[PDB]
Structures are given as C-alpha cells and as structure tokens.
C-alpha cells in the first residue's frame, strides 16, 4: 500500500464520506498528468490508489474535493479543494498517508510516512 | 503584551466573538487557583489579562470556552472547553499569544512567544 | 472499543509512539478521578481503555502527556500536555475516537464518533 | 486589505519569516495566470499584494513557499509548498486573510473573510 488518502470532518466528528479525491504526477513540461483517483469510502479512506510498481519518484499533487463534500451536506465552504503536493522518495520509509481534516474555513493536512 | 488570547472560528471564517476565557495557575498545593478572565472581542482577542508584574513565573491553564460559545449559536458541539497548559516565564518575561481555531467537534491551538 | 486514542505526529510525519495517556472521569464533587490509562503503541493508537460497561455518560478529560514524548525526542516543547474535555452522551453514535496532531508549539484534536 | 497571508511556524512558535508567496488566477482558459507575489514580513504577515481595483472576482491560488522556508533552516519538509485555492469576490468585495500554520511534515490553513 503505497499512498493511501484519509478524510476527517470537523463539523460533524465523522470520517469524510464519498469525498473525491484526484492524484496527479507532474510531466517533463510541468503540466500535471491524471494518476490515480478514487472517492473515501464509509471510514473516511481511500485505499488502492497505486501499486508500488507504479508509484515511482517525482512530484505528486492529491486535490481532495472539499467543496463538493461541504455541498452535498448543505454547508457553505470556502475553499475549492485541498491540494497536497509533494515528492515521492525512496529514501525515507515506504508508505505514504495523507491525511485531512475538513473544516468549512479551514483544513489541516499530514502525511505519515511509515514502513 | 505579556498574554493574549485569540479565537477564530473555522465553521464561518470569522474571529470567534464574545468567547469566555478562565486562566489560572497552578499554586504551591498544586490546586489551579483562578488567574484572569475575559472574553473575546469582535476581533477574536482577548487583551488586557494581566500585567508584567502579577504574570510571573508558574504553570498556566487557558480555558476557552468553546461549548458556551456553540451554544450560544445554536449548536451541540463537542469538547466542555479546551485548555491549554503550559510553564510560562521561566526564562524571563516572554510575550505570549494564545491561539485556538474551532470547530464544533475538532479544534487546534497554537502559541506564539515573543522575547 | 467505546473509547480509543491516536497521537501523530507533524514533525517526523509519524505515529507518535510511547506517549502516555491518562483518562480521568469527573466526580460529584468537581474533582477528577483516574479513570483508564495506557501509553500509544508503535501504531501511535491505545486501544483497550475501557469497556461499555464502564464507560457510562459523564464529563471526561484525556492527558496526552505531549512534553515528555517531545523531550524523549530531544525537541523543546511548550505545552505541558494536551487536554481533551467532552461529555459522554449516550445519544449519539457508540463509539469515540480521540485523535490529536502535535506540534511544539501547536496541537490539534479532533473527536470522530461512529457506529 | 483586500488580501493578506500570514503564516506561523509550529516547531518555534513564531511568525514565519521571509516566506515566498506567490498568487494566481485562473484566466479565460482555464491556465493559472500570475497574480501577485510577495514574502512575509518579521510577522510573518504578507502585506500589499493587491488593491481593491486588481482584485476582482476569480478563482485564486495562493501557493505559500513551504519547502524553501524549511530548506533556509536547514529542515528537510514533505510538502512542496502549500495551495490555498478559493473563489473571491463572487459577492461583492471582501476582505481575506489566508492564514497558515507550519510543520515540517503538517500544515493547516483558515480563511479569515470580513465584509
């Protein structure tokens, strides 16, 4: 399990449900190409993104559709989306999370690097 | 300004106003005897608890009382309040900026401190 | 598992692992009373607090002793511990999980409530 | 002040200092167009970017220079920078301040907006 992406919601104190969640890898020319996509399920999670054979280094951006989410409970947010952009190295241990906490104004994000 | 107290409110992306906050300090029977009070003005701060000279050296707990402040919005939060504890001035008078951003179930806390 | 606790922490992008966690209940005459404690295992989780027998509503405060896991590391904290205050209700969903991310200077904590 | 970005430092407790800032609007064709740019002050506020008459209504990204910053201190971080990406002035003009919040491996980030 490379990359796993986790949606917490501070309004409701409740994992963030049927959030869309995009990963993109950057190009040789900068533009950002589609990589792996996917929406959290009942838990707040979304597993299955990637396999280690495809998850090689370089930059990575994870948009987390926090707007959409805010919408469909009929809250008003402020934000697009959540954007998470950071590089994949293998140096350090081998599997990312990437969490978020969902707050309509406001959002906190932290990878855990584990092995 | 030897302490200050901030709260913003994430649900709305506004300070958080009319806030109680309760500061006391840990006494030599080691009871937290009652420091300061105030509450938040329409900037989300608090100014004006203490003085240079009562703010001495000792352990601190800053009680925002965030439960009141959700209810008097119309909203069953979480947390009774959150507290903040810390040792204060034991290298000298610094200034200290207390800050709490909040959510009805979830809610972050930050000190700055300035020499 | 009516009550579960899980540290991570934002500067090595971890599990915060060996924190100690003290749970107390309050009793009728304002006091509080050890209830359930435990130190994070390598999974930054306690598990095992209580049981539903024991875990009947009433006003809870979770210690996460947040200065002693910073000073283990070698890192210079300010906050003493951090505080978790909320009532139990049996009303809302079973059970509750009592998440923090710290910082040195800055934690936050987030209460997710499920069935 | 029509925009404003303030950013804190969680391993300190301190303003941010000298934080790269750079803003964008999406144009006509989708292409994210630069806007403004700046750093921020000893207080880890970021002043002047813009004036009521250039800031119109528009989906901006203010993209806050979080590797650099932990790099010139000698700190190894996980993000790249980190993207704050909101529609403004859909209603009118309004006041933002995009606050951000730093660790090494976390960030959190509040839109403070007043009419």
Not at 4 to 27: E, Y
Not at 40 to 67: M, Q
Not at 107 to 114: D, G, L, Q
Request: net charge negative; aromatic share 10%.
């Amino acid at each position: 399990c490379p990359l796993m992406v986790k949606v917490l919601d501070a309004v409701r104190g409740s994992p963030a449900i049927n959030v869309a969640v995009h990963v993109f890898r950057k190009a040789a020319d900068d533009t950002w190409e589609p990589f792996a996509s996917g929406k959290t399920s009942e838990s707040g999670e979304l597993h299955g993104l990637t396999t280690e054979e495809e998850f090689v280094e370089g930059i990575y951006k994870v948009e987390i559709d926090t707007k959409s989410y805010w919408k469909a409970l009929g809250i008003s947010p402020f934000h697009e989306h959540a954007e998470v952009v950071f590089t994949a190295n293998d140096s350090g241990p081998r599997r990312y999370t990437i969490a978020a906490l969902l707050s309509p104004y406001s959002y906190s994000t932290t990878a855990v690097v584990t092995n």
